[PDB]
């Protein structure tokens, strides 16, 4: 593939030879639409990254949930970290809003006080064994899935969280809080739970790069056990 | 109460008398500031309520609701749809297992997405049970300003 351009005020204009790239991408697109395949990732992280703030506007831009949103502004120079935050909050809502994906944590959460209230602390049961009634209520809120109950969105969220925690040294965990009912993302830096906007320049920029790359890899590789092992080129 | 105005350039300006209205409003304000009382509501819904208003309200829901926020924009752009949707979603997020006091946003913080991670952080309601005795010193502290007592977010939704 050759990109060519002639200077201003030149009678003879040079053309570009981009046909083979179109042919290869046509192969990818046609095969993918007929039967889902793993798509390559093309990202550019130039100096336009490290911009301040996050999630500036609601960004009505095309439904971050859909797969081909991973190619939007992918080579712009600055990763769309607002897109990542919106997608992460989407994943958290999908995970916590499924009875099958909530009864699993309800069952585990109930079988944690027994490991604690049995030893003592009679004050950690008044408003905590009431949550056992919620697990009992989940029985009548269910019996429609019975089997499976393995959400794809939960797997994507876990993969992205593991990648973020493994690559970024200071960050140990990342999650979404809904109480105080603005949606906000919190991380753990050096053992301290801090929100996403109080990061420093160097831990927020690197996290933005890693999170955007992980999101695009996960969205473009749905048929891989580890989506981050997909192929692509990153600048 | 008489509201008066004179045309610009007139030698003599008509004066409006608003003293008795101020007296009644002072009665209301002082009695409320000593002991909580139910206050009147004055709302105007003009034809501009249907127009889609723009306020750049993104993450503006820090929303420390005081009792006197009901008098803000009450005779102007009061009944807007986007504000209702935003407030309703915010309140529903807060209302889920409604516990939220000035302190219980921390109890729900340690009882949600915590209580499952390792590291000897099993502390749930344990460290702040002595702070839970400050709940009366906390939930009554928000309305300790007796002029600003409101209902809970569930009796309000």
Q: Which residues does a chain break follow in chain A (C to N more than 2.5 Å)?
A: none
How far apart CA B157 and CA B151 sit, in angstroms, is 10
**Contact between residue A187 and residue A199 where contact means Cβ atoms under 8 Å apart:** yes
How far apart CA A176 and CA A125 sit, in angstroms, is 26
Does any CB of chain B come closer than 8 Å to the CB of residue A124?
Answer: yes
Q: Three-state SS for A165? A: helix
A residues 47-76 near B, CB within 8 Å?
55-58
Contacts of A182 in chain B (CB under 8 A): 59, 61-62, 90
Q: Beta partners for A194?
A: A187
Instruction: Return the structure tokens found at B78.
Output: 């009061």
CB contact under 8 A, B91 and A181: yes
Range A31-45 burial, b when 16+ CB lie within 10 A, else e: eeeeeeebbebebbb
- Can you state the angle between helices A130-140 and A99-117, rounded to 10 degrees? 150
Identify which of A85, A91, A105 has the alpha carbon closest to the alpha carbon of residue A212.
A85
Range A207-218 burial, b when 16+ CB lie within 10 A, else e: bbbbbbbbbbbb
**Contact between residue A176 and residue B114 where contact means Cβ atoms under 8 Å apart:** no
How far apart CA B35 and CA B27 sit, in angstroms, is 12
Compare CB distances from B126 to A121, A180, A181 and report the shortest one's residue: A121
CB contact under 8 A, A175 and B113: yes
CA–CA min distance B34, chain A (Å): 30
How far apart CA B114 and CA A105 sit, in angstroms, is 11
**Contact between residue B114 and residue B124 where contact means Cβ atoms under 8 Å apart:** yes
Stated length of chain A: 235
Q: Three-state SS for A186? A: strand
Stated length of chain B: 157
Identify which of B101, B113, B80, B107 has the alpha carbon closest to the alpha carbon of residue B152.
B101
CA–CA min distance B47, chain A (Å): 27
How far apart CA B76 and CA B129 sit, in angstroms, is 46
User: At a CB cut-off of 8 Å and minimum separation 6, what does A89 contact?
Assistant: A176, A183, A185
> What was the resolution (in A) of this experimentally determined structure?
2.7
CB contact under 8 A, A182 and B90: yes
Residue A159, number of CB atoms within 10 A of its CB:
20
How far apart CA A220 and CA B86 sit, in angstroms, is 33
Instruction: Return the structure tokens found at B21.
Output: 């209205």
Q: Beta partners for A233?
A: A42
Please, what is the Cα angle at B121 between B120 and B124, to 5 degrees? 135
**Contact between residue A55 and residue A82 where contact means Cβ atoms under 8 Å apart:** yes
Please indicate the experimental technique that yielded this structure: cryo-EM
Please, what is the Cα angle at B147 between B146 and B152, to 5 degrees? 75
How far apart CA A217 and CA A87 sit, in angstroms, is 13
Give the residue carrying structure tokens 């269910």. A142
Identify which of A228, A227, A235, A187 has the alpha carbon closest to the alpha carbon of residue A79.
A235
CB contact under 8 A, B89 and A181: yes
Give the residue carrying structure tokens 């008509």. B14
Instruction: Return the structure tokens found at B40.
Output: 């009147």
Q: Which residue of A has its CA nearest to B130?
A: A123
Contacts of B112 in chain A (CB under 8 A): 177, 179
Residue B106, number of CB atoms within 10 A of its CB:
15
Label the pairing between strands A232-234 and A41-43. Answer: parallel
Q: Decide: residue B95, CB within 10 A, 0-12 exposed, 13-18 middle, 19+ buried.
A: middle
């Amino acid at each position: 593939i050759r990109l060519s351009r002639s200077a201003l005020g030149t009678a003879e204009r040079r053309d570009s030879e981009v046909k083979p790239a179109k042919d290869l991408a046509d192969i990818w697109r046609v095969i993918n639409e007929v039967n889902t395949i793993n798509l390559p990732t093309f990202a550019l992280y130039n100096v336009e990254r490290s911009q301040p703030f996050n999630r500036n506007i609601k960004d009505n831009t095309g439904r971050r949930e859909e797969r081909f949103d991973a190619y939007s502004q992918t080579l712009g120079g600055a990763g769309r970290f607002d897109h990542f935050v919106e997608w992460y909050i989407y994943l958290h809502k999908r995970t916590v809003s499924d009875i099958s994906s909530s009864i699993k944590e309800l069952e585990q959460q109930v079988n944690d006080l027994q490991r604690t209230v049995d030893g003592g602390m009679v004050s950690v049961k008044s408003l905590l064994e009431q949550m056992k009634f919620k697990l009992s209520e989940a029985i009548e809120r269910n019996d429609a899935a019975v089997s499976s109950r393995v959400l794809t969105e939960s797997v994507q969220k876990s993969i992205v969280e593991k990648a973020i925690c493994s690559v970024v040294p200071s960050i140990s965990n990342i999650w979404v809080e809904m109480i105080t009912g603005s949606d906000l993302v919190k991380v753990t830096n050096d053992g301290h739970d801090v929100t996403i906007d109080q990061l420093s320049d160097g831990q927020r920029v690197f996290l933005s790069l890693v999170a955007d790359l992980a999101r695009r890899m996960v969205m473009l590789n749905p048929l891989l056990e580890n989506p981050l092992e997909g192929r692509g080129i990153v600048l």
